[PDB]
């Protein structure tokens, strides 16, 4: 057994995390009460990666729910699968973070972080061989962003040789709660550059454009965006939840995907995205969409940069020969967007169990230098306010100095430069 400990922090983190356990619990035949009721042994093959087994053949997710206010987690507890979570794994305060990175990271968050670690330690001790950690959170708020990155820093201090993986929702003005999101995201990105091995960049702008333009949803809600996130998180973790040789565990994934330590921010993609919904999707169609920018969750044009590494996962009963053919047809027909100094940097994996309500699907995981576009948007919105010191008093009032912002600014601009040099 090689266990993954899941952590979800803040409003976004807990809402997206809730849907994730909802979706994979269905795939593994687990019902809202933790009782297995599937019809295939492949469902229990890697079940212990994400689930603990209790008395009575009960499967309890190895999940830790964290927040600085009780609102969202109360929803999860009363949510569809809310009963399945270990009641001892809910850790929450009462003050909230006020969408303030400094509060999550230095004041309100600091007061709660040790109680989260106690639960993390309790979950780790019951692990045969802990693979590492995955964290769901947004970067534009205070709890998931500020306390989320504080947790990672302290998890790394205590488990320096475990893999740290995150699903990080980047803020966008098109789907914004407060104007300080660029501040919170830029402070967080520097934390992730240092202390995570893999970060799936989930851009709310891309999630919006997909819902509006592709899915034809007039007014997307957070629930609509989360449906895309739930599906994407299920795809990228398929290789971890079912048997296979390619990217089977977190460390092997990191070895194949990360050529340089700081460039570990991935663009995920999913297919199909259908709004004419019963039609069977052919392998050529899965491959074309999966590589199409309109299917990218990071709101970046891959044609503006180059792929360092690519991982693809195909789910369902399909022509494995026709998969290799189409995958090799995308590379040989667009090799100008794949770096030529990493041979055979496009890996493909196949899983028989498809997602709920789909004959077959394809999940895309790209380490593209085009991701620098995302960090450029954040940097520009950050500088536009920081040059006038706008809204800084919310942060100086929590003990922060302007110097820490200046260094976050430089750090993310260095990151953009490092991406630019490998694109040339």
């Amino acid at each position: 057994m090689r266990e993954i400990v899941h952590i979800q922090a803040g409003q976004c983190g807990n809402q997206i995390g809730a849907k994730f356990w909802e979706v994979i619990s269905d795939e593994h035949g687990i019902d809202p009460t933790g009782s297995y009721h599937g019809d295939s042994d492949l469902q229990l093959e890697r079940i212990n990666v994400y689930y603990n087994e209790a008395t009575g053949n009960k499967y309890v997710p190895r999940a830790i729910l964290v927040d600085l206010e009780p609102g969202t987690m109360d929803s999860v507890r009363s949510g569809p699968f809310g009963q399945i979570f270990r009641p001892d794994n809910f850790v929450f305060g009462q003050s909230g973070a006020g969408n303030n990175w400094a509060k999550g990271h230095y004041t309100e968050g600091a007061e709660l972080v040790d109680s989260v670690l106690d639960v993390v330690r309790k979950e780790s001790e019951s692990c045969d061989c802990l693979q590492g950690f995955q964290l769901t959170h947004s970067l534009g708020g205070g709890t998931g962003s500020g306390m989320g990155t504080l947790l990672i820093s302290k998890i790394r201090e205590e488990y320096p040789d475990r893999i740290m993986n995150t699903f990080s929702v980047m803020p966008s003005p098109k789907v914004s709660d407060t104007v300080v999101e660029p501040y919170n995201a830029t402070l967080s990105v520097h934390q992730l550059v240092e202390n995570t091995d893999e970060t799936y960049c989930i851009d709310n702008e891309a999630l919006y454009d997909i819902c509006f333009r592709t899915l034809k949803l007039t007014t997307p809600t957070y629930g609509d965006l989360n449906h895309l996130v739930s599906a994407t998180m299920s795809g990228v973790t398929t290789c971890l939840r079912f048997p296979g040789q390619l990217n089977a565990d977190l460390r092997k994934l990191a070895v194949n995907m990360v050529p340089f330590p700081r460039l570990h921010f991935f663009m995920p993609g999913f297919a199909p995205l259908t709004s004419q919904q019963y039609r069977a999707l052919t392998v050529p169609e899965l491959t074309q969409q999966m590589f199409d920018s309109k299917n990218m969750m990071a709101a970046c044009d891959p044609r503006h940069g180059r792929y360092l590494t690519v991982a693809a996962i195909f789910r369902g009963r399909m022509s494995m020969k026709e998969v290799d053919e189409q995958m090799l047809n995308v590379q040989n027909k667009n090799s100008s967007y794949f770096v030529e100094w990493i041979p055979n940097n496009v890996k493909t994996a196949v899983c028989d169990i498809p997602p709920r309500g789909l004959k077959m699907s394809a999940t895309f995981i790209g380490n593209s230098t085009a991701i620098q576009e995302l960090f450029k948007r954040i940097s520009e919105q950050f500088t536009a306010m920081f040059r006038r010191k706008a809204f800084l008093h919310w942060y100086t009032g929590e003990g922060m100095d302007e110097m820490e912002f200046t260094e976050a600014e430089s750090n993310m601009n260095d990151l953009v430069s490092e991406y630019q040099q490998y694109q040339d």
């Binding site: 990217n247 070895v255 194949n256 290799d324 100094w341």
Partner: protein, 437 residues
Amino acid sequence: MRECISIHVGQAGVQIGNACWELYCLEHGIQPDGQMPSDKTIGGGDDSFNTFFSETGAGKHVPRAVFVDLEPTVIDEVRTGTYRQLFHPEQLITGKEDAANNYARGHYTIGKEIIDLVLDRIRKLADQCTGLQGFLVFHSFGGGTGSGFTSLLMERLSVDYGKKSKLEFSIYPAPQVSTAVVEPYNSILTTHTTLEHSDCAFMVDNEAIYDICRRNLDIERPTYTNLNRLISQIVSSITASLRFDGALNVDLTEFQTNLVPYPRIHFPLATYAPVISAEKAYHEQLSVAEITNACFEPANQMVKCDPRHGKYMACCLLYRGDVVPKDVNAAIATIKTKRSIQFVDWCPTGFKVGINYQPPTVVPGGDLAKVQRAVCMLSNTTAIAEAWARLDHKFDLMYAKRAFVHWYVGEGMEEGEFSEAREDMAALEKDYEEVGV
């Protein structure tokens, strides 16, 4: 009678080893429970097959094999599989977490912590040997365990068994079935530290096995099972002389004598024929001349290259089935006049021939058709240097940017070992050029 200990390291080594011992049992009439009816000496004896099997008082024939993997899911297949009874627990060694396709992680980090346990289990087998010949080590180039731990194991074996021969069966990385971008790093790293410790190594390119499986067996997308059953036939052809009565390659020392005049150039090219689909209606049995001529077709080699543009240093023909020396010499003569077979001026232009009358055994329900005769040619061509060139080139592309190097340094390996290993391969490529050009 002198014993041979087989060592299977990593997933590739363990799964290939599992397929070989399946075939060995079928070839020697050994049953899954370990009982060998045709063996009349119960719980003892020094027959030819006893080089690979020991015997218990209860008449069980136990492989002289050690399985080593840093992660247990593969070796658990053996513990609960068809031939679970053949082995005892002390032979199957597994760890908790693997080398993550990281040579440094398997050689240094994890290797340092399990090496002494592995030598101990091997010593238990050596203590049962009245005259140990040496070891057969199955492993991949690309895996972190296959590459990393194997090279450490080969260093210690040279220390604890300085006078014993060591032969390798090594799986060369092929992107069509590969699972790691860094396998070129691991391949060169392990070849460098293992070179001076291996006497004879048989490289099998998964690309070659893959195409043979698609072209000759009509498997559209071959699996590891399809690959390993074909690979085990070739391995069986190579080790048959150790397990059956004969006079050619009857001990591990004879492999180096007959195939390796220059110690660093110890990578013989293997070619096998025929490979016939089991689903075929009914194939016309190829003759000694036809299967022999097939040993010079690039499509049947274990490594894709062009021997026409190299030079031979040695050449062994290992026939199994209905073959007589008269028909072999006839075919050989016919081939010299039709093929470009250039030997080195300092090596006699000759062929060593071995014939085992028992035709190739095929696993029931496998993909290979039963044939009346087959051959495996072992030839030391400079043409196999093409495989080193390809691999070295991929290494150069990534290392020029230091891509993925931090994973190795992070495990304690110094960056200089990269260039040290790559410079050794450069010298190896120069040695091939000096001999065949």
